[PDB]
Amino acid sequence: RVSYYGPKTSPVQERHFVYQFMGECYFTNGTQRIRYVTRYIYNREEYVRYDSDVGEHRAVTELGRPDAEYWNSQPEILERTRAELDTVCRHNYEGPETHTSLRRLEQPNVVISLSRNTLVCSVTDFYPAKIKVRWFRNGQEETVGVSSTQLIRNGDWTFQVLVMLEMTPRRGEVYTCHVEHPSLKSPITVEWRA
Amino acid sequence: AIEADHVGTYGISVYQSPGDIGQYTFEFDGDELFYVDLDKKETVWMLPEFGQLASFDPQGGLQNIAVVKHNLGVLTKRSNSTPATNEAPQATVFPKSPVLLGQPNTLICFVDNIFPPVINITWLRNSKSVAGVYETSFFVNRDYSFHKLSYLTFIPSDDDIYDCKVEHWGLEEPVLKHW
C-alpha cells in the first residue's frame, strides 16, 4: 500500500515535566507551495523550531539556543530535517493522503424540521468542510432572519451545520433548503410544504 | 499563524514524567488519522477504512517517543527542574444532534485547556456513574494546551439530567457540568 512517514524527532545533547514535538505541513495549490514547521515544546513553551521558510533551527527561548545551534552544526541532522519537506510532507500528501483524506467524499444529509416560528434546516454528516446553505421561500433567496451555526466538527471525519430560518407558515407556501457541496454532482434541494 | 489550504499535523508526540505517559498521533485538517497505542505497539486508526487504505509502522512512533523521553530528561535537568504549570480546564456539554425524546444520540463533553495531558473525565447521568462512552486522544491546541472529547451514546428521556465530571490537577476539587 502507501505508507505514512513521520518526522524524525532530532535528539538533544507532586511535580510533572512535559515535552512535546510536532511536525506541521502546510500545503497550498496541492504541492505547488509546501511549508514545513517542526516545533519542540517544553512545558507549554516552544523553545526550538525549524521553519522551512527560514531554513535553519531557530531558538524561541533561552532553553532553545543549545539545541538550535547544535542541530544546525551537524549536517546529518539539519539537511535531513530540511529534506523532511519532501520525505514527510510531500510524501504523505502525494501518497497516503491522496488515498485517504483527499479521497473522502461524504454527501450531506439535509433535513428540514419545524421547532415550535422557526424552520431548522439541518445539514449533517459530510466531508470535507466547504459547503453553502441557502434558504428559499416560494423560490426567492431569503437572507433576512437567517441564522446559521458555525461549522461543527463531529470528530469522526464528518461535519454538521444547522441553518435556522425565522418565518410564519402561510398555507400553500413552499420553503426549500438549497445545499451545495463538493461531494455532490448536483446541489441538494429539500422542500417543506407549509 | 500560517495560512494554507491543507494542514497535516504529522508526528504529534507527547511525553510526561514521572509516570511514563506518552502519546503519538497523526492529524489531518483537524481530525485524527490514527494514534500509536504505545503499550500494544499498534497503530489504532480513527477510521478503520483508512487503516485498510494506508499504513503506518508503529515502530516509528516508538522510537520518536524514545527520543522525546531523552530530550525530556535533558531539558528537565537544563531548566533547574522547572516543573509544569497546571491549567484550569473548561468543560462544555451538548448533544450531537438537537435533542428529541427517545432518539438515539451522542452527548458530547468537550474539555479544553488541559495541561498536563492527564485527565479523568467521568459521566454522571442520574447522578450515578455511567459508561458505551468512548473518549479520544488528546488534541493539541495552538497554546500547547490540550482538549479532549468524551462522547456518550444515550437515549434521551425527560427523567434523568446529566453532568460531566472532570478530574484534573489544576482543579482543587472536581468540577461538574450539568445538562
Epitope: 505508507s3 512517514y5 513521520g6 524524525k8 532530532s10 535528539p11 546529518e76 535531513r80 520525505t87 514527510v88 510524501h91 | 511514563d20 509502522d57 515502530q59 516509528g60 512512533g61 516508538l62 522510537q63 520518536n64 524514545a66 527520543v67 523521553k69 531523552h70
Partner: T-cell receptor, first 112, second 111 residues
C-alpha cells in the same frame, strides 16, 4: 527480502570481485554493505543511498539501480585480506523503525 | 566499544542462559541478532532505551531486557538445541546509519 548472488565467490589476487544484491520492497532507500571477518562481528564497510547510483571509496564501489532494484558491490584489485563475508542490508528509513533487514551475505575467497 | 559476555558458553537443555551486552558509545538503540549458515543475520530483540524492549523477527524462546542505557541482555529461560548459534549484540544512535556489532558469542546448547 534482500537476496544476494552468488552465495559465495572466489577471485584471484588483483581481479575485480562483483558481489550482487537485490531487494523487493521499493520503499528501501538506505543500503549499507557490512563486512565480516572470521571470528569477528561485522562492521559497516560501505553504504549508499537511493539518490546516488554509484558510491566510490577507493577500491570499493557500490552500483545502485533503482529501476531494476539491483545493487552491485565492486572490489577492484582485491587483496587476500578481502576474503570475508559481505552482507547487503536495506532499510526504508522513512519508517523510522531502526530495523535493518540483512541479506544472507556472499562469501569471498581471494586466491593469493 | 560493544563487548558481549560471555564470549563462549555451554549449557544443557532446560537451563537458563543470560547473554549480557555492554556498550560504551552513549548509543540508545541496542540489538540482539544471531547468525546461522544459510539464514544470514536474524534479529531476535532490540530496545530503544532503558525500560523498553521490542520484539524482533524471532522473539520465540528469548526474552530481552534493557535495565540501563549501556546494558542489553538476552535471556534464554528454557534453552533448546535449536538455540545453539553465534549471538551478536549491536548498538546504534537514534536514526543512526551505522550499526556497531560486538565481538561474538558462541553458544552451544546440548542435551
Amino acid at each position: 527480502q534482500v537476496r544476494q548472488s552468488p552465495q559465495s565467490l572466489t577471485v584471484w589476487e588483483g581481479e575485480t570481485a562483483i558481489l550482487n544484491c537485490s531487494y523487493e520492497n521499493s520503499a528501501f532507500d538506505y543500503f549499507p554493505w557490512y563486512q565480516q571477518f572470521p571470528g569477528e562481528g561485522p562492521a559497516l564497510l560501505i553504504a549508499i543511498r537511493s539518490v546516488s547510483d554509484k558510491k566510490e571509496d577507493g577500491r570499493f564501489t557500490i552500483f545502485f539501480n533503482k529501476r531494476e532494484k539491483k545493487l552491485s558491490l565492486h572490489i577492484t584489485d582485491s587483496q587476500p585480506g578481502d576474503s570475508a563475508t559481505y552482507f547487503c542490508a536495506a532499510s526504508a528509513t522513512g519508517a523510522n523503525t531502526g530495523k535493518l533487514t540483512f541479506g544472507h551475505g556472499t562469501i569471498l575467497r581471494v586466491h593469493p | 566499544a560493544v563487548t558481549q559476555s560471555p564470549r563462549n558458553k555451554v549449557a544443557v537443555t532446560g537451563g537458563k542462559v543470560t547473554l549480557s551486552c555492554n556498550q560504551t558509545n552513549n548509543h540508545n538503540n541496542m540489538y540482539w541478532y544471531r547468525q546461522d549458515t544459510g539464514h544470514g543475520l536474524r534479529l531476535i530483540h532490540y530496545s530503544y532505551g532503558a525500560g523498553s524492549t521490542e520484539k524482533g523477527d524471532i522473539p520465540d524462546g528469548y526474552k530481552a531486557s534493557r535495565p540501563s542505557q549501556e546494558n542489553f541482555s538476552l535471556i534464554l529461560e528454557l534453552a533448546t538445541p535449536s538455540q545453539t548459534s553465534v549471538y551478536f549484540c549491536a548498538s546504534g544512535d537514534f536514526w543512526g546509519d551505522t550499526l556497531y556489532f560486538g565481538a561474538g558469542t558462541r553458544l552451544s546448547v546440548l542435551e
